Design a protein around this ligand. Structure first.
Ligand SMILES: Nc1ncnc2c1ncn2[C@@H]1O[C@@H]2COP(=O)(O)O[C@H]2[C@H]1O
Lengths: 627, 150
C-alpha cells in the first residue's frame, strides 16, 4: 500500500490504481471532488514519510512545488515575526496558496511530532488536475481566529481579513519581475488606496518597519539571505506605491513623513552593506489653480447676528471646534458659541464640533455664522448672499460660444486635476473620520452648481424677450461645444440650468426659439434620462476616449451607494470585496485624467462668475418677466 | 413600468431603504453601476430614483422629480430638523411636475432606536404614514407598495 503510493505516476498498475482510489474515498480533503478528478489523483498522489519531529517540510519564501495532505501526525505553520501561527492535524491539507498564485510560500511547515505521513501532489499534476476545482475557498486561521478569506475568482483574491493579514498577503504576493511591472502596480493599488479605511498610517508604518526587518527562522545562510532580500525588495515596492499614491499629501501626516525619512535611511544603509536595491534606492530618494492642502491657511470671515464679522486665521483642515476657539479668541468669549451655515434663502444648518474643513462645503452664496443657540432662529442672510441684480449679457454675448466653452473646459480641467483620488475616499467614508480636507473636490463639485445657476441667473435677469431667446440659443450652443470637448460635467450643468423651473416656465421664450435648437435641446434633455441607471449618459461616456470630465453628481452617487449598500466589516474582518469596489470607482477618475487636454477677457469672465443661487428669488424674477 | 423617487435630508436612511428594498444589505454585494441596480419586479417593474449622496445638487432632485410618478418623503425620528425640511420638498414636486396632485407617501425612518429618539409619531399624522426602519426591515416593502396603488 505504502509501496504502491511510492511508485511513480507512469509505473502504477491498473490494480494499484483501483486499490488507491478506494482509499481516497476515505479522505475528507478529497470528498468534494468529482469521480473523474479522484481517479486521476489515484495515479498522481505520492506517499511521503518523515521520522523526526522538527523536520522542515519547506521554508517561507521558497517557490512552491507540491500540495500536501496529512495522513498521520501534525505540523506547525510558522510565519516570520509571528512564530507558530497554527497547527494542522490529521486530515488537513496545505500548500495550495503558492501553487495557485505562483507566489513564494506564505509560511514554513515544520513537523510537530515523530513519524508523520503525507500524501503529495506535485506542481505539474496539481495544475492539470486540481487547479480549477480544489480549494476554491480558503479561510486561513491564526490562534483559532479567522484571519484571512481567499477565494478563487487564475490567482486568489482577498475577500476579507484582518488589516495585518491583508497587508501580509499583499506583501508576500508582490511580483518583482521587471516584465510584470504594471501587473503588480494594479493589485497593490486596491490596498494602497483603501488602507486609510481599515489600517491608518499610525498602524501601517510600524507594520511596514517590522516587516522590512523581519528575518527568516528557516533555511541555510544563503537561503535566509535570499528570503530576506526579496522580502525587503517587496516592502520597498509597497512603500513606493504608497508614497506615489499620497504624493504631496504626505505633508499632512507627520507619522508618514517620519517613517519615510527613517525608511530611506534604513534602505540606504542596507544598500551600502548588501550591494542591492540599485533600481529602487534612487526612486526612494526622489520622494524624500494649485491643489489646496489641509495645512494651508485661510483668512475666513465668520459673521455675528448683527452682520459684523471676525477674520480668523486657521488651517484649511481645521475642525469646527478649532473655528469656535479662533472666534472666541478674537472676540473674547466663554459664552457657548455654535457654528452655523446659512444659505441665501435663510436656510440654516448647525455644524457639529466634530466637523472638519467646512469652509468649502458651503453653498455658492453661503456664509458662516457664530452665535449662541438662542440666536439661531433669529439669523438673517447678508445682502452679499443674494447675488447680482443686473445681468452680464452685454459682456459674454460679445464672446464666442466656442471660446466660452473652451475657457470653461480649461478651467474645469484645472479644478478636476486638483482633486486627489484619496479625497473621493475621505468624502465617501466621512471627513471627520480622517481629519483630512476634501477642499479640491468640494470646489469642483460646487462648480456644477455655479454653472447651473449662472444660466438661470442670466436668463432671469434678461428683461428683453428677444435677447432672452438669444440667450437660450447661446447656452444650448455652449452646452454642445462642451460635449464636443468631452466636458460632460459642464454640459449637464448647462442643460439642467435650462431645465430649471424658472427657465422652463418661459413659454413665450421657448416657443419663439428656432426648431433647430429646440431639437438640439430635446436630445440633450434625453441624455440625462435616469432610466435603467442613467443608461443614456453611461453609454455616451463609455463611447468616449480618456480625456473627459464625467458627470460628477452621478459619480458621487455611485460612491455613496457602494458605501451604504455594502458593509465595511463582515464577521469582524475587513470586507475587501467592498474596498475593491470603491477603488474601481475612484480609478475611474484616474482613467478620465490619464490623457492631457487640447483671450484673457473670456478667461476672466468664466473664472469669476456671479450667481444667484436663491431659487425663490429666481422664480419671482421669472414670474414678473412672463406672468 | 413605474418610477418611484426617494426624497429627504442626509443621514435619514434614504440609501439604506433603497438597497434594502431592491436587493438587501449584507446578503448580497451591492453594485450601483449596473442597469438593474435600482430596478425591482413586483406584476410591475419599479425604478427607484434616490437623491441620496446628491442632496447638494438641486438639479439632480428636480430631474428625478420630473421623471417620477411616486414620491417617498423620508425623515428621521432621531432628528428634529428632518420633518421640518419636508415642507419645501412637498411644494417643489408640485412645481416641476406642473400638476395639481401627485401620489406620494410620508415615511418616518429609524424607529428601531427609541433611546435616542427626539421626534414623535404625532407630527406626521396629519400631512399615508409609516414608522419604518431600513436596518430592521420594518415596513421597507410597504413604502413602495403604496405608491404603485396610488
Ligand atoms: N494562517 C495561515 N497563513 C498562511 N498559510 C497557512 C495558514 N494556515 C494554513 N496555511 C497553509 O500553509 C501553507 C504554506 O505554504 P503555501 O503558502 O503554499 O500555503 C499555505 C497554506 O495552505
Amino acid at each position: 500500500m505504502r509501496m504502491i503510493l511510492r511508485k511513480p505516476p507512469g509505473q502504477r498498475t491498473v490494480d494499484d490504481l483501483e486499490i488507491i482510489y478506494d482509499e481516497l474515498l476515505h479522505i475528507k480533503a478529497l470528498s468534494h471532488l468529482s469521480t473523474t478528478v479522484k481517479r486521476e489523483l489515484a495515479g498522481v498522489l505520492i506517499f511521503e514519510s518523515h521520522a523526526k519531529g522538527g523536520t522542515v517540510l519547506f521554508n517561507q519564501g521558497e517557490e512552491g512545488t507540491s500540495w500536501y495532505i496529512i495522513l498521520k501526525g501534525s505540523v506547525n505553520v510558522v510565519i516570520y515575526g509571528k512564530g507558530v501561527v497554527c497547527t494542522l492535524h490529521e486530515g488537513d491539507d496545505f500548500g495550495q496558496l503558492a501553487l495557485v498564485n505562483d507566489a513564494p510560500r506564505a509560511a514554513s511547515i515544520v513537523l510537530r511530532e515523530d513519524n508523520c505521513h503525507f500524501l503529495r501532489v506535485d506542481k505539474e499534476d496539481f495544475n492539470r488536475i486540481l487547479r480549477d476545482v480544489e480549494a476554491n475557498t480558503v479561510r486561513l486561521k491564526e490562534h483559532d481566529q479567522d484571519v484571512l478569506v481567499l477565494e478563487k475568482v487564475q490567482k486568489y483574491t482577498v475577500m476579507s481579513g484582518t488589516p495585518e493579514k491583508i497587508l501580509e498577503h499583499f506583501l508576500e504576493t508582490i511580483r518583482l519581475e521587471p516584465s510584470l511591472n504594471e501587473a503588480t502596480d494594479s493589485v497593490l493599488n486596491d490596498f494602497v488606496m483603501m488602507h486609510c479605511v481599515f489600517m491608518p498610517n499610525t498602524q501601517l508604518c510600524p507594520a511596514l518597519v517590522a516587516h522590512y526587518h523581519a528575518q527568516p527562522s528557516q533555511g541555510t545562510e544563503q537561503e535566509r539571505m535570499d528570503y530576506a532580500l526579496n522580502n525587503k525588495r517587496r516592502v520597498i515596492r509597497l512603500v513606493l506605491q504608497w508614497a506615489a499614491m499620497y504624493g504631496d499629501l504626505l505633508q499632512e501626516d507627520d507619522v508618514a513623513m517620519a517613517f519615510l525619512e527613517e525608511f530611506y535611511v534604513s534602505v540606504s544603509d542596507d544598500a551600502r552593506m548588501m550591494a542591492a536595491f540599485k533600481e529602487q534606492l534612487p526612486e526612494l530618494e526622489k520622494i524624500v489653480r494649485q491643489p489646496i492642502r489641509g495645512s494651508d491657511e485661510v483668512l475666513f470671515k465668520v459673521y455675528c447676528i448683527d452682520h459684523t464679522y471676525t477674520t480668523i486665521r486657521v488651517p484649511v483642515a481645521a475642525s469646527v471646534k478649532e473655528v469656535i476657539s479662533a472666534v472666541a479668541d478674537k472676540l473674547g468669549s466663554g459664552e457657548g458659541l455654535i457654528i452655523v451655515k446659512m444659505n441665501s434663502g435663510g436656510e440654516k444648518v448647525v455644524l457639529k464640533s466634530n466637523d472638519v474643513s467646512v469652509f468649502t462645503t458651503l453653498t455658492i452664496n453661503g456664509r458662516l455664522f457664530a452665535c449662541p443657540r438662542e440666536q439661531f432662529d433669529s439669523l438673517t442672510p447678508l445682502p452679499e448672499q443674494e447675488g447680482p441684480t443686473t445681468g452680464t449679457v452685454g459682456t459674454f454675448e460679445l464672446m464666442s460660444s466656442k471660446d466660452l466653452a473652451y475657457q470653461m473646459t480649461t478651467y474645469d480641467w484645472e479644478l478636476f486635476n486638483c482633486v486627489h483620488e484619496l479625497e473621493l475616499i475621505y468624502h465617501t467614508f466621512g471627513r471627520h473620520n480622517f481629519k483630512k480636507t476634501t477642499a479640491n473636490l468640494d470646489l469642483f463639485l460646487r462648480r456644477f452648481n455655479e454653472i447651473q445657476f449662472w444660466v438661470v441667473t442670466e436668463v432671469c435677469l434678461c428683461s428683453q424677450l428677444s435677447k432672452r431667446v438669444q440667450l437660450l440659443k447661446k447656452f444650448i450652443k455652449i452646452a454642445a461645444h462642451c460635449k464636443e470637448y468631452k466636458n460632460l460635467n459642464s454640459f449637464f450643468a448647462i442643460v439642467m440650468g435650462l431645465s430649471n423651473v424658472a427657465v422652463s416656465r418661459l413659454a413665450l421664450t421657448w416657443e419663439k426659439l428656432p426648431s433647430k435648437f429646440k431639437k438640439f435641446y430635446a436630445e440633450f434633455e434625453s441624455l440625462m434620462d435616469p432610466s435603467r441607471n442613467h443608461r443614456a449618459y453611461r453609454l455616451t461616456a463609455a463611447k468616449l476616449e480618456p480625456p473627459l470630465i464625467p458627470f460628477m453628481p452621478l459619480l458621487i452617487k455611485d460612491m455613496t451607494f457602494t458605501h451604504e449598500g455594502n458593509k465595511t466589516f463582515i464577521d469582524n474582518l475587513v470586507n475587501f470585496e467592498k474596498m475593491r469596489m470603491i477603488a474601481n470607482t475612484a480609478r475611474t477618475v484616474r482613467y478620465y485624467r490619464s490623457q492631457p487636454f487640447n483671450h484673457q477677457d473670456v478667461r476672466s469672465y468664466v473664472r469669476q462668475l456671479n450667481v444667484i443661487d436663491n431659487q425663490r428669488t429666481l422664480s419671482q424674477m421669472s414670474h414678473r418677466l412672463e406672468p | 413600468e413605474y418610477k418611484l423617487v426617494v426624497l429627504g435630508s442626509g443621514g435619514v436612511g434614504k440609501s439604506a431603504l433603497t438597497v434594502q428594498f431592491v436587493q438587501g444589505i449584507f446578503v448580497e454585494k451591492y453594485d450601483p453601476t449596473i442597469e438593474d441596480s435600482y430596478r425591482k419586479q413586483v406584476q410591475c417593474m419599479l425604478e427607484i430614483l434616490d437623491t441620496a449622496g446628491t442632496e447638494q445638487f438641486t438639479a439632480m432632485r428636480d430631474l428625478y422629480m420630473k421623471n417620477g410618478q411616486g414620491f417617498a418623503l423620508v425623515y428621521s425620528i432621531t432628528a428634529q430638523s428632518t420633518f421640518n425640511d419636508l415642507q419645501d420638498l412637498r411644494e417643489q414636486i408640485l412645481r416641476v411636475k406642473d400638476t395639481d396632485d401627485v401620489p406620494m407617501i410620508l415615511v418616518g425612518n429609524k424607529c428601531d432606536l427609541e433611546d435616542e429618539r427626539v421626534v414623535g409619531k404625532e407630527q406626521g399624522q396629519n400631512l399615508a404614514f409609516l414608522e419604518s426602519s431600513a436596518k430592521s426591515k420594518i415596513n421597507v416593502n410597504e413604502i413602495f407598495y403604496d405608491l404603485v396603488r396610488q
